[PDB]
Amino acid sequence: AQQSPYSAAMAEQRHQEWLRFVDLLKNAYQNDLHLPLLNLFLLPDEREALGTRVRIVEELLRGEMSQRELKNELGAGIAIITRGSNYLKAAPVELRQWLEEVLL
Amino acid sequence: AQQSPYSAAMAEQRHQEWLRFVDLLKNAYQNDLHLPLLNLFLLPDEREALGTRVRIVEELLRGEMSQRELKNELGAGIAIITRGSNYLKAAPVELRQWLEEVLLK
Numbered sequence A: 001a002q003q004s005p006y007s008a009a010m011a012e013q014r015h016q017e018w019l020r021f022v023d024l025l026k027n028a029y030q031n032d033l034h035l036p037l038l039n040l041f042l043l044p045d046e047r048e049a050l051g052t053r054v055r056i057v058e059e060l061l062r063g064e065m066s067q068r069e070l071k072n073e074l075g076a077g078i079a080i081i082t083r084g085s086n087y088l089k090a091a092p093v094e095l096r097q098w099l100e101e102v103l104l
Numbered sequence B: 001a002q003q004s005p006y007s008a009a010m011a012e013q014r015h016q017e018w019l020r021f022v023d024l025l026k027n028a029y030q031n032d033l034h035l036p037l038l039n040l041f042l043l044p045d046e047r048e049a050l051g052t053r054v055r056i057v058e059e060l061l062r063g064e065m066s067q068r069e070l071k072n073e074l075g076a077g078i079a080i081i082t083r084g085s086n087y088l089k090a091a092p093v094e095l096r097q098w099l100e101e102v103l104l105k
């Protein structure tokens, strides 16, 4: 299923729309408007999920909590641990090194 | 006491966890790591939804796209237009005014 000019054109547009959000948020942090901006663009349950994903990443990096603890404390089952681990492994090395410094 | 202690305790925890995310992202922006951090913490489908929500807010603020165009171009039917409009109305006026300056020019 190789990509066509139609599919490539749509994918480029979606990427530019994502970058426009990223840039809006960047400027909101510089204006101290990021809290209401994130409340406008993210639903309550989405904000809750992001806060939980940070805890999962933190605990996976620390390597102390067992899988049972991850489930009971964070609601994180084996599937989400596996995905979370894959995303950590796929991260650029500069990000992983920075997350170990900030979260730990 | 707006809530009972079980609900208050949960809310307090979620609130601290959300602010932890917000500060991590703040510092990622300052370190130029925001793009990989957002790839790590947001699924591709979520990133697409946020990019689309920005277009929806832009078009609701601009006032020129019709209801049928919002549906056909952005997948925004009546219910999502209504919710989007309600969120805009609930926003502090300062943010709405800033969005018009930043998105519309």
Ligand SMILES: O=C(O)Cc1c[nH]c2ccccc12
Residues within 6 Å of the ligand: A053, A056, A057, A080, A083, A084, A085, A087, B040, B041, B042, B043
């Ligand atoms: O995979 C998911 O279900 C959501 C998700 C996105 N980024 C994450 C990082 C850690 C744990 C879960 C996620």
Ligand SMILES: O=C(O)Cc1c[nH]c2ccccc12
Residues within 6 Å of the ligand: A040, A041, A042, A043, B053, B056, B057, B080, B083, B084, B085, B087
């Ligand atoms: O209501 C939704 O389905 C998600 C959503 C969150 N913030 C929004 C702004 C504009 C349009 C939709 C949304």
